[PDB]
């Protein structure tokens, strides 16, 4: 007979001891551990809710991979590249480039906790997290690999994180900040609680459903399978927060949650916002991006924060406001500078689409519609020179995304600037500036892509110079309009 | 910009390979953090973690112009590792099941449960130290193919911890007055036979240079564990009519030999730079006496 897990599982994490040949601080240095001076004895109270054991892990994960690869093999003849809506193919290119090597980087945030967390349960769950993120990085390289032969843009599934392309810098500056560049307890709070529990879990669920709607069952099944892994390691941040809150560090816990949610939001708005409201074909639109945020993201944050004895972030009103506005401008930025993206943005402004945008965001036509009016007129009169940029956008020194506002009738745009140690920094929100000021040594000498351009690092100091700096290797790699301006026919 | 045709594989592999292996597709050249020497991470160059990586990875006295070219001799990916380990672990779970049905633990020789309580169950601490240490080599190593070997080694370390946890509990059921599952922390911290091992691991876990961490963990500590812990434990089990423990250990030994094999492949790769021979030698010379003292104090406790 076998003895049930509950009977012996406690021994798996009975692994704290009192060091005596080195000190506790040498073994768990605050810069890598982030224990905030709380002693080893106290971290033994760490109470993660969900259990995983090594024999169970290897068996279930073997089965999950068998299924995912069998589906891929079975659907090889689906002709997804050829038959999909361009909006879907661009969804895939953007997804794989922003995500695949980022999942691999998450192995490192997990490893940071595996070695440096004072909580024994955290150390074991993070080992499984290391494994899970390895799976995800490998899956999301192996799957798009078939597409390299079809389209050079799929090379960016591997290449994006090895590039200085602006959106890649945005993703790396975010991930390097919350995953690979901080102590163990920060990673627990910023990655597992704030990003994975707060965003990616629900995002992947939505993405898998969109994939199925798009008729791509290999991808739908891939993303579903990956999402099933999430709770196993995403669970780690809540208990760390509870323990900090119990041990006199509520203010520090709240600050780290506040920063990580904001940072996650800005990247989410540029990468996923536009996909949902502009790329996904109209008739296949389940809901809008704001509806997604309201159904899947906002209330969930509110309730889990309440559950921990934490509060809504100081900026909550701003966040809710941003949901109405930000991604519409980020989309316009991505589309107008499309030649700088490794995917082909869909404009998403047929009259039919504009009606949808109006009912989802009342006043859309009087704001973003004004800009899209000018753009559409230029396309219809074959003034294509006026539909491509001849300068660079100004970029936030935190998010690494262009500084945007509300255009048209309600024109409002604000840059939050800061002089610090003799340099002028510009931010895209009050919150981005605040995040900088919470931890200046993390950020202060970083140069954004425009800082680099002005400093002489990008040669020649021109559009074409920038594109070569950003790592484009051929004409075909640079983003174009997804539908080759066919939308203008409906105008 | 010119027109170029689609490549059959990733741009970094396309010159050399028409159809690279699954291993190469999913494993090769993933540490973007080695691209910018003065800014590993996309942050201020002097951010704390940037300073950590510049000191402990980039500046290691163990040097190679092409770490990214290291290849796991077994070429394991997540998928193939779980194929392999679900096999091995299902075998071990069947061993536990069947030996439990046979009432194995009741058949062991007088006193063996006390030897197990003192010399076997506290290995959960040692194995957890290997787990933590393999995690550290993972996060610091200067190539994704090296880090991947460490990932899988970290998991194997937890595998062994979990066996030890399961068998400590199971054994305590037959022998409830032996302290099994209640005294391991005390033994690890205070029993002289464990102090060599504990000092060794405390010191190893605070060697932060990636090269020193690799060489001390994988070239010194881990082979000492094979020869001075796992093998003598098998011998003792034999002498005490414990036939489960040697079969369990043979499974764990397959894991240890795999770790040995990749480690030896990394040394072969490192030795392409002739300056590395003396560096690796010097770390071995440094760590060996501590490991030999650990082994010696353990072996005599095991037999006492």
């Amino acid at each position: 007979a076998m003895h049930p897990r509950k009977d012996w599982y406690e021994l798996t994490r009975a692994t704290n001891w009192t060091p005596s040949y080195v000190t506790e601080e040498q073994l768990f240095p605050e810069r890598m551990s982030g224990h905030m001076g709380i002693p080893l004895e106290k971290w033994e109270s760490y109470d993660e809710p969900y259990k995983t054991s090594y024999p169970e892990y290897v068996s279930i994960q073997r089965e999950k991979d068998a299924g995912a690869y069998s589906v891929k093999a079975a659907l090889e003849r689906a002709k997804i590249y050829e038959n999909s809506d361009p909006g879907w193919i661009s969804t895939l290119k953007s997804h794989y480039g922003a995500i695949a090597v980022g999942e691999y980087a998450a192995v490192t945030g997990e490893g940071r906790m595996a070695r440096f967390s004072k909580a024994p349960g955290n150390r074991n769950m993070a080992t499984f997290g290391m494994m899970d993120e390895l799976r995800h990085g490998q899956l999301q390289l192996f799957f798009p690999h078939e597409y390299c032969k079809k389209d050079r843009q799929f090379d960016w599934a591997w290449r994006a994180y090895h590039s200085n392309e602006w959106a890649a810098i945005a993703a790396k500056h975010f991930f390097d900040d919350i995953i690979t560049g901080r102590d163990a307890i920060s990673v627990a709070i910023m990655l597992t609680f704030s990003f994975e529990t707060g965003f990616t879990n629900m995002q992947f669920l939505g993405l898998a459903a969109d994939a199925a709607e798009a008729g791509d069952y290999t991808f739908a099944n891939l993303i579903s399978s990956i999402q099933t892994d999430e709770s196993r390691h995403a669970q780690q941040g809540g208990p760390a927060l509870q323990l900090l809150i119990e041990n006199g560090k509520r203010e520090e816990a709240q600050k780290k949650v506040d920063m990580a949610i904001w940072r996650a939001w800005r990247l989410f708005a540029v990468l996923t916002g536009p996909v949902m409201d502009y790329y996904t074909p109209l008739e296949d639109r389940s809901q809008s991006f704001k509806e997604f945020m309201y159904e899947w993201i906002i209330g969930q944050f509110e309730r889990s924060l309440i559950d921990l004895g934490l509060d809504k972030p100081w900026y909550w009103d701003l966040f809710l406001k941003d949901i109405d506005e930000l991604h519409h401008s980020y989309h316009m930025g991505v589309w107008y500078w499309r030649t700088t993206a490794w995917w082909n943005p869909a404009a998403g402004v047929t009259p039919e689409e504009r009606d949808w945008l109006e009912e989802k965001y009342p006043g859309w036509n009087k704001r973003w519609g004004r800009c899209w009016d000018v753009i559409t007129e230029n396309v219809l009169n074959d003034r294509m020179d006026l539909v491509s940029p001849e300068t660079l956008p100004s970029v936030c020194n935190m998010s690494q995304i262009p500084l945007v506002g509300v255009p048209g009738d309600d024109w409002n745009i604000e840059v939050f600037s800061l002089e610090h140690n003799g340099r002028l920094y510009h931010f895209g929100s009050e919150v981005d500036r605040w995040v900088f000021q919470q931890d200046p040594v993390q950020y202060q000498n970083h140069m954004n892509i425009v800082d680099r351009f002005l400093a002489g690092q990008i040669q020649p100091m021109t559009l074409e110079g920038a594109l070569k700096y950003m790592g484009f290797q051929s004409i075909e790699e640079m983003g174009k309009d997804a539908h080759d301006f066919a939308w203008a026919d409906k105008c | 910009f010119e027109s170029k045709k689609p490549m059959r594989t990733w741009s970094h592999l396309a010159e050399m390979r028409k159809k690279p292996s699954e291993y190469d597709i999913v494993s090769r050249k993933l540490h973007y953090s080695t691209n910018n020497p003065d800014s590993p991470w996309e942050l201020s160059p002097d951010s704390p973690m940037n300073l950590w990586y510049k000191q402990y990875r980039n500046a290691s006295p163990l040097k190679h112009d092409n770490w990214d070219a290291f290849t796991d001799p077994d070429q394991l990916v997540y998928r193939t590792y779980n194929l392999m380990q679900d096999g091995q672990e299902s075998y071990v779970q069947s061993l536990f099941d069947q030996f439990n049905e046979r009432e194995h633990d009741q058949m062991v020789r007088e006193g063996w449960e006390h030897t197990m309580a003192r010399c076997y169950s506290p290995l959960r601490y040692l194995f957890h130290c290997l787990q933590m240490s393999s995690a550290y080599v993972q996060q610091m190593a200067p190539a994704s193919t090296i880090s991947n070997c460490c990932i899988l080694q970290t998991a194997d370390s937890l595998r062994w911890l979990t066996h030890t946890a399961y068998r400590t509990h199971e054994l305590s059921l037959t022998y409830p007055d032996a302290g099994l599952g209640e005294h391991e922390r005390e033994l690890w911290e205070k029993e002289p036979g464990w102090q060599g091992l504990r000092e060794l691991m405390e010191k190893q876990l605070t060697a932060f240079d990636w090269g020193e961490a690799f060489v001390s963990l994988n070239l010194v500590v881990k082979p000492m564990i094979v020869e001075s812990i796992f093998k003598p434990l098998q011998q003792q089990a034999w002498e005490n009519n414990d036939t489960l423990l040697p079969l369990l250990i043979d499974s764990q030994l397959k894991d240890a030999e795999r770790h040995s094999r990749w480690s030896k492949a990394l040394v072969k790769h490192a030795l392409e730079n002739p300056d590395n021979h003396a560096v690796i030698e010097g770390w071995i010379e440094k760590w060996r006496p501590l490991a030999d003292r650990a082994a010696e104090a353990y072996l005599s406790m095991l037999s006492s």
Binding site: M332, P393, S394, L403, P407 | -
Partner: protein
């Protein structure tokens, strides 16, 4: 005497890098910014364009140069109509 500024044009959705000259009048500045915006994503208007420090209530005189303005390289300006 290249002088980078970040400029937000009335009715547009972003701030952009625009490189002006140290001795450009505000009239000339507005013209260099308008080039990256008007008929690209802002409809053209008749009227005079004015330049101010970002978010400021006060407008710079049309004939003031950026040298005279007290502006420093990489500061943020708005370009707006009367």
């Amino acid at each position: 005497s290249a002088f980078p500024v970040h400029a937000a044009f009335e009715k547009d959705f972003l701030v952009q890098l625009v490189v002006v000259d140290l001795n450009d009048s505000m009239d000339q500045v507005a013209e260099k910014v308008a080039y990256h915006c008007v008929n690209r994503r802002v409809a053209p208007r008749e009227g005079v364009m004015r330049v101010r420090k970002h978010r400021s209530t006060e407008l710079f005189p049309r004939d003031m140069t950026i040298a005279e303005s007290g502006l420093n390289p990489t500061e943020v300006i708005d370009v707006v109509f009367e």
